């Protein structure tokens with residue numbers, strides 16, 4: 658159920674300016 662992790666991450670990265678390419682390092686949900 659990777660889509661659960663993906664949806665979390667997409668919602669988390671909702672404040673990235675237009676042309677963004679960045680590595681986010683945090684205490685993110687794991688599998």
Ligand SMILES: *[C@@H]1O[C@H](CO)[C@@H](O)[C@H](O)[C@H]1NC(C)=O
Nearest residue numbers: 663664665667668669670671
């Ligand atoms: C979280 O993701 C859902 C879609 O699964 C979306 O409808 C909702 O608005 C998102 N929340 C935030 C804060 O982006």
